[PDB]
Amino acid sequence: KLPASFDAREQWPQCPTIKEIRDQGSCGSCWAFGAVEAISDRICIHTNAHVSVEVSAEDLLTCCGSMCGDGCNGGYPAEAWNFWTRKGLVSGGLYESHVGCRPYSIPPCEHHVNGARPPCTGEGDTPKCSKICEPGYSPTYKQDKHYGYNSYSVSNSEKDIMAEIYKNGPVEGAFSVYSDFLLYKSGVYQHVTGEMMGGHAIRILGWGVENGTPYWLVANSWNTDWGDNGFFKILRGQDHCGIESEVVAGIPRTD
């Protein structure tokens, strides 16, 4: 039944969000980014590409409140997806994209890598919940909401996580970042050196095998100049750094 490799970008080639790497900026909003990325993908899968939208990281980050955590000071996937079922999420693209209702208000920056943008800094304030779309956008904030049918934890089981992605699309996950992860370039990440830095929320969109090493295909929210064009591979099948232990997803409501 399950193929040896799977890439959500190949299964759903008319869903451009699955291909798209975001930049969370100088803000600990990865909990929100992994959610709205996977939700964007699932809305396009659920509709056979008839609805393809960038779901607003801004709307989740700023309007969820204490349910989801402490905004830019961190938060948790499971409550992000619950918020999507209860209040829904509007559209919004990248910083100064003018795409959708609430495009992300926090500028892009360099995440543990060299390049032309300012280096990412800490102590970012969470922006306030603004329940209005950017001037000129149609429809209204309330009309632009996309709701979840449900939210659920996927079991700590490689095969269940594979089947979930294979059937319903990309998922959110979370793992323990050790300092060697920050320098990832290519190949299959395994923790070999360095201290624990903290928990990190990402989007899992496939799996594969590289040099007899089974891996998960994962999107980071650190822009495309980090890692492998913004993606990485991580060891699959041993709950490596807890990669299989905090998987969350949900089914969209037909708008």
Ligand X SMILES: *C(=O)N[C@@H](CC1CCCCC1)C(=O)N[C@@H](Cc1ccccc1)C(=O)O
For the record, the structure tokens of 173 come out as 């996950």
* Contact of 53 with 123, CB cutoff 8 Å: no
> What residues numbered 153-182 form the site for ligand X, per CB under 6 A?
177
CA dist 175 and 173 (Å) reads: 7
Angle between helices 77-86 and 30-46 (to 10 degrees): 50
CA dist 54 and 103 (Å) reads: 9
Q: Taking the complex as a whole, how short is the minimal distance between the CB of residue 139 and ligand X, in angstroms?
A: 30
Q: Taking the complex as a whole, how short is the minimal distance between the CB of residue 167 and ligand X, in angstroms?
A: 27
Residue nearest to ligand X (CB): 30
Catalytic residue check, 220: yes
Among 30, 35, 217, 247, interactor with ligand X by CB under 6 A? 30
Residue type, 26: S
For the record, the structure tokens of 226 come out as 């980090």
| 120 touching ligand X, by CB under 6 A | yes
What is the enclosing helix (H) or strand (E) of 248? strand 248-249
Determine the interface stretch with ligand X among 7-15, 91-99, 115-123, 183-191 (rule: CB under 6 A): 115-123
13: number of Cβ within 10 Å: 11
∠ CA 176-122-133 to the nearest 5 degrees? 100
Determine the interface stretch with ligand X among 7-15, 22-30, 97-105, 233-241 (rule: CB under 6 A): 22-30
Q: Is 185 exposed, middle or buried (0-12, 13-18, 19+ CB in 10 A)?
A: exposed
| 26 touching ligand X, by CB under 6 A | yes
Catalytic residue check, 50: no
Backbone φ and ψ of 201, nearest 5° = -100, 135
Catalytic residue check, 211: no
Q: In sequence order, what E strands does 166-230 have?
A: 171-178, 188-189, 196-210, 213-219
Pairing of strands 248-249, 152-153: antiparallel
Q: Taking the complex as a whole, how short is the minimal distance between the CB of residue 140 and ligand X, in angstroms?
A: 30
Q: Taking the complex as a whole, how short is the minimal distance between the CB of residue 132 and ligand X, in angstroms?
A: 26
| 233 touching ligand X, by CB under 6 A | no
Among 22, 200, 203, 240, interactor with ligand X by CB under 6 A? 200
Q: Which of 200, 223, 240, 241 is catalytic?
A: 200
Q: Which is nearer to ligand X, 77 or 252 (CB)?
A: 77
Q: Which of 15, 63, 168, 220 is catalytic?
A: 220
For the record, the structure tokens of 172 come out as 């959110």
Place of tokens 């349910």: 67
Among 17, 29, 56, 126, interactor with ligand X by CB under 6 A? 29
Among 135, 136, 198, 212, interactor with ligand X by CB under 6 A? 198
| 62 touching ligand X, by CB under 6 A | no
Q: Which is nearer to ligand X, 61 or 249 (CB)?
A: 61
Catalytic residues: 30, 200, 220
Residues that bind ligand X (CB under 6 A): 24, 26-30, 111, 120-122, 177, 197-198, 200-201, 222
